[PDB]
């Protein structure tokens, strides 16, 4: 085996410094192809890791470079023939690779060959091969290098458009399948989902099925750190494409059960975008919405954490946009939201310190809040006053304003009475 392998490597080497032409070699290509279909089959075996990896490497690389050469120059018949066989082989490899490591990277060289090779590569052979490529990328580094190179590089025809997104729809199906099990494997799966995103951040194309899938999916049994990493991954995968903020917003608004995903995409926009004060507005909208609905009532288990998540999305937003107007209308709103524990944490975080202290200084905003509270609604008003107080500086004007508040406060027959109680505490 070793002796035979050594001879094969030698042969490969020889053909390496003798392949500076490549004209009418369709014959060579075909022969090679059939031989190597069989050879790949045989190849899945043993052979001192990389003794086999080297062999395989040569074969693939060599093979693809030649098969796709056919595609470039020559005849479609031959091309199709090779593809059919090669696709089968690709499928086979997508299985072997792991232990090989060096030859797993040789299989990665074969996938890079598919990239160069284009439509043939893209087809039957590369349906399973795109899946494998995704896996490899999410397994990492060198793959990533090549991948981001192609992330700018006309995107490999945006990974072959329809098919690219169809593979992504297969990935949507896979996301659904992961929602089921997937610990670190699914972490990398999501990584590769986003790898494809980087490759062809063709959002719309990807679309619908996947959208729904993802939505449902945000509740994996094995969250841990991989889970949040991947949360970030999908959110940041949204990045900045077509429908972007809008699309995201839509699905999220529907099932207001996932504002961590809101944060994710908020932040996706924050580190990947366009229409920027317009994105401040989008953000603003979502943010505002969130607070307004949620903090419009109360909660206990899940939605207390939902409020926490809301603080996080506020975060992304606020920081990213320096939005200040939109942002702090919602901060005076959202800040006013703070309430207990976690609240404060989230508040400062979202605040993005400059503006946090800006608000601290701010008294016009305070007056706005004063009258807001005057109109009242519930506990929102109550705690608004609470944190207003917390935000100590110097009443002065606010002292006079609050005297008026009290007066109203005092008056209160209904729950406006307890509002006044808390207010009074603040005043004290």
């Amino acid at each position: 085996x070793x002796x035979x392998x050594x001879x094969x490597x030698x042969x490969x080497x020889x053909x390496x410094x003798x392949x500076x032409x490549x004209x009418x070699x369709x014959x060579x290509x075909x022969x090679x192809x059939x031989x190597x279909x069989x050879x790949x089959x045989x190849x899945x075996x043993x052979x001192x890791x990389x003794x086999x990896x080297x062999x395989x490497x040569x074969x693939x690389x060599x093979x693809x470079x030649x098969x796709x050469x056919x595609x470039x120059x020559x005849x479609x018949x031959x091309x199709x023939x090779x593809x059919x066989x090669x696709x089968x082989x690709x499928x086979x490899x997508x299985x072997x690779x792991x232990x090989x490591x060096x030859x797993x990277x040789x299989x990665x060289x074969x996938x890079x060959x598919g990239x160069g090779x284009x439509x043939x590569x893209x087809x039957x052979x590369x349906x399973x091969x795109x899946x494998x490529x995704x896996x490899x990328x999410x397994x990492x580094x060198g793959x990533x290098x090549x991948x981001x190179x192609x992330x700018x590089x006309x995107x490999x025809x945006x990974x072959x458009x329809x098919x690219x997104x169809x593979x992504x729809x297969x990935x949507x199906x896979x996301x659904x399948x992961x929602x089921x099990x997937x610990x670190x494997x699914x972490x990398x799966x999501x990584x590769x989902x986003x790898x494809x995103x980087x490759x062809x951040x063709x959002x719309x194309x990807x679309x619908x099925x996947x959208x729904x899938x993802x939505x449902x999916x945000x509740x994996x049994x094995x969250x841990x750190x991989x889970x949040x990493x991947x949360x970030x991954x999908x959110x940041x995968x949204x990045x900045x494409x077509x429908x972007x903020x809008x699309x995201x917003x839509x699905x999220x608004x529907x099932x207001x059960x996932x504002x961590x995903x809101x944060x994710x995409x908020x932040x996706x926009x924050x580190x990947x975008x366009x229409x920027x004060x317009x994105g401040x507005x989008x953000x603003x909208x979502x943010x505002x919405x969130x607070x307004x609905x949620x903090x419009x009532x109360x909660x206990x288990x899940x939605x207390x954490x939902x409020x926490x998540x809301x603080x996080x999305x506020x975060x992304x937003x606020x920081x990213x946009x320096x939005x200040x107007x939109x942002x702090x209308x919602x901060x005076x709103x959202x800040x006013x939201x703070x309430x207990x524990x976690x609240x404060x944490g989230x508040x400062x975080x979202x605040x993005x310190x400059x503006x946090x202290x800006x608000x601290x200084x701010x008294x016009x905003x305070x007056x706005x809040x004063x009258x807001x509270x005057x109109x009242x609604x519930x506990x929102x008003x109550x705690x608004x006053x609470x944190x207003x107080x917390x935000x100590x500086x110097x009443x002065x004007x606010x002292x006079x304003x609050x005297x008026x508040x009290x007066x109203x406060x005092x008056x209160x027959x209904x729950x406006x009475x307890x509002x006044x109680x808390x207010x009074x505490x603040x005043x004290x």
Partner: protein
């Protein structure tokens, strides 16, 4: 416009079909008849994301507003298209979806309006549409609505451009045709796909 649009958005959100349309119709008529700058202004004024698709829906409600909608929204597009979001949702709509006899007409007139408001919008869409004709993954995927949409597109395309258009687009067309052909030659509705072929054929004989 702010209040108007606020209200508009709200309206749409709150309720489609009847409400919206009735209002619209009457309004439309009147407005059309007597306004230009102002017309344009209100129209323009339209907003939100909820109201963007709010307006998508609105627009389609108005489409259902039929031929009145056509002429008047030829003037409504003439009131206003103002690039950006219009384009966004135009293609949003382009992509998707549900019910289009109204849009056939819908499609047509809408297209007409916008296209003529701002030339070459169409061209891009037409260009874009070519890609949409394709399959494989799509062949595996979709329902039959997509095909419906496709048909409509074909029709509009046939209707207008530059001439020159034909030539370059024909590059793409040919390409499209070939792959598409294969795919759809595989059409159950083999004839559906065939019909498309004939259309295209005609287009660049």
């Amino acid at each position: 416009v702010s209040f108007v649009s606020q209200v508009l958005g709200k309206a749409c959100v709150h309720g489609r079909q009847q409400e919206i349309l009735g209002v619209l119709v009457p309004r439309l008529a009147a407005l059309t008849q007597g306004s230009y700058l102002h017309q344009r202004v209100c129209w323009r004024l339209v907003e939100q994301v909820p109201d963007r698709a709010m307006e998508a829906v609105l627009t389609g409600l108005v489409e259902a507003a039929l031929g009145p909608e056509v002429l008047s929204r030829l003037l409504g597009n003439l009131v206003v298209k103002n690039k950006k979001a219009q384009f966004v949702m135009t293609q949003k709509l382009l992509f998707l979806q549900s019910r289009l006899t109204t849009p056939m007409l819908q499609s047509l007139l809408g297209h007409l309006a916008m296209d003529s408001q701002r030339r070459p919008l169409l061209l891009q869409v037409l260009k874009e549409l070519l890609e949409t004709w394709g399959s494989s993954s799509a062949i595996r995927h979709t329902p039959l609505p997509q095909q419906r949409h496709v048909s409509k597109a074909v029709l509009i395309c046939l209707a207008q451009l530059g001439e020159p258009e034909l030539r370059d687009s024909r590059d793409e067309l040919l390409a499209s045709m070939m792959a598409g052909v294969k795919c759809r030659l595989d059409s159950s509705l083999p004839p559906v796909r065939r019909l498309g072929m004939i259309v295209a054929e005609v287009v660049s004989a």
